[PDB]
Amino acid sequence: GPLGSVKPDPPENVVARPVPSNPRRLEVTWQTPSTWPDPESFPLKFFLRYRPLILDQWQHVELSNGTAHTITDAYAGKEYIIQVAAKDNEIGTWSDWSVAAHATPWTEE
């Protein structure tokens, strides 16, 4: 493609785990795609967006080099659809929203 800055494949190992010590924290962890070689030499910008299952509010978080995002803005009583995208810091090769992780922080009741 763009010879080098090829559109990064959908992030892998994308698992949103709920913190039992926080009824609103969602440890959204992930990793670079299997197709992606070195995540260091190629700063992969991850675009995370968490929208409540009761409100159509698509958030916008940029992770220049984040692989473990912790969001305390997640509702424990409602599911959160956190979609993760990929892109290259060098050349703008925006990748459409792929992985749509489903999670729910510690439902303290």
From Swiss-Prot:
Hey, what tissues is this thing expressed in? Nervous system and skeletal muscle.
Name its cellular compartments. Cell membrane
Where does the Fibronectin type-III domain lie?
10-109
Q: Which residues, by range, are in coiled-coil regions? A: none
Q: Where is this motif: WSXWS motif?
A: 94-98
Highest taxon, organism lineage: Eukaryota
The function of this protein is: Binds to CNTF. The alpha subunit provides the receptor specificity. Receptor for heterodimeric neurotropic cytokine composed of CLCF1/CLC and CRLF1/CLF-1. Acts as a receptor for the neuroprotective peptide humanin as part of a complex with IL6ST/GP130 and IL27RA/WSX1.
Task: Give the protein family.
Answer: Belongs to the type I cytokine receptor family. Type 3 subfamily.
Assembly, in brief, is: Forms a heterotrimer with LIFR and IL6ST. Interacts with heterodimeric neurotropic cytokine composed of CLCF1/CLC and CRLF1/CLF-1. Either alone or in complex with the heterodimer CLCF1-CRLF1 interacts with SORL1; this interaction may promote internalization and lysosomal degradation. Component of a receptor complex composed of IL6ST/GP130, IL27RA/WSX1 and CNTFR which interacts with the neuroprotective peptide humanin.
Q: What is known of its domains?
A: The WSXWS motif appears to be necessary for proper protein folding and thereby efficient intracellular transport and cell-surface receptor binding.
Name it: Ciliary neurotrophic factor receptor subunit alpha
Q: Which organism is it from?
A: Homo sapiens
